[PDB]
Amino acid sequence: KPLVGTGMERAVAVDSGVTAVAKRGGVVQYVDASRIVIKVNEDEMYPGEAGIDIYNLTKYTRSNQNTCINQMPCVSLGEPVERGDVLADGPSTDLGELAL
């Protein structure tokens, strides 16, 4: 995190699409720094579905400029999450703030 910023980090890190963002609200079912998987709540589920959103995170991979890009969890098992919360940090982010 930068200690002094502008509050734009909370937007660049999310909108740049590189943090993995919770598509629907629910509770964390499992985490292991490769997968994060969310038991979506029935208030946002679609009726025939299992009702479970996995997020297979991208781990160590080359960026187009050869820097690595491993996503890491920020959640804990059994923690609640709401649509649009950051589930996993990107490169250069933590808790979803930009952090070069």
């Binding site: 499992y30 985490v31 292991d32 720094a33 490769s34 781990k59 491993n70 890491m72 098992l77």
Partner: protein
């Protein structure tokens, strides 16, 4: 010629990690001269004890991941690098670790010994996060001094280590910051006798009652070349 010589009159282990020590009395200047010399020696040259290799059962390199654990294997190595332990009369030792079931993994899980003593049981290695999950690993510790990065170390080993070891950078020096301070004190009904205070923060493996004497010893023997000239 009127030089009063010091004695190390007092010590205060204010925490399991932090302590104060005082050397008293001193003449003109010697409060500063030792005050800085011992700080600079204590930071460079106190020997200590570091993790140096780690072998974890099913991993292959630093960048992998283990099913059911909250950290990339790399952040496990960044955690174990900070772990500190005493070892009793040994140049190295191997520690086994095993845990299973959900929850934290902490240094208290290491297979303890009489001859190893850990400064902080709660220092955390990872979380386990699945009901059947496990890690088992063989942490190797070495004694040493200063800092030795693994890149030069393997270039110093000159045999080829097996696949599935991890290497960590060695940071033996057990003192994290040292401060010194000088002040006048009641002796012999006279002024300008410095009570040197040295006060210190450490990784917890050593006690000042050794440390200041060991630092003074190093100084005393390095200095021999200047009287032996």
């Amino acid at each position: 010629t009127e030089f009063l010589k010091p004695r190390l009159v007092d010590i205060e282990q204010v925490s399991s990690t932090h302590a104060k020590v005082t050397l008293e009395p001193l003449e003109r200047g010697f409060g500063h001269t030792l005050g800085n010399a011992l700080r600079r020696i204590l930071l460079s040259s106190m020997p200590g004890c570091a993790v140096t290799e780690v072998e974890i059962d099913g991993v292959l390199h630093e960048y992998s991941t283990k099913e059911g654990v909250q950290e990339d294997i790399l952040e496990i190595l960044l955690n174990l690098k900070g772990l500190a332990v005493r070892v009793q009369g040994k140049d190295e030792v191997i520690l086994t670790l095993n845990k299973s079931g959900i929850g934290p993994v902490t240094a208290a899980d290491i297979t303890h010994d009489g001859d190893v003593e850990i400064v902080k049981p709660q220092h955390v290695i990872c979380h386990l996060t699945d009901e059947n999950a496990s890690i088992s690993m063989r942490i190797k510790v070495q004694r040493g001094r200063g800092y030795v990065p693994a890149s030069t170390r393997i270039h110093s080993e000159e045999d080829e280590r097996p696949i599935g070891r991890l290497l960590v950078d060695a940071c033996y020096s057990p003192v994290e910051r040292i401060a010194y301070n000088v002040e006048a004190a009641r002796v012999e009904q006279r002024t300008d006798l410095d009570k040197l205070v040295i006060e210190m923060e450490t990784n917890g493996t050593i006690d000042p009652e050794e440390a200041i004497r060991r630092a003074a010893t190093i100084l005393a023997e390095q200095l021999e070349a200047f009287v032996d000239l």
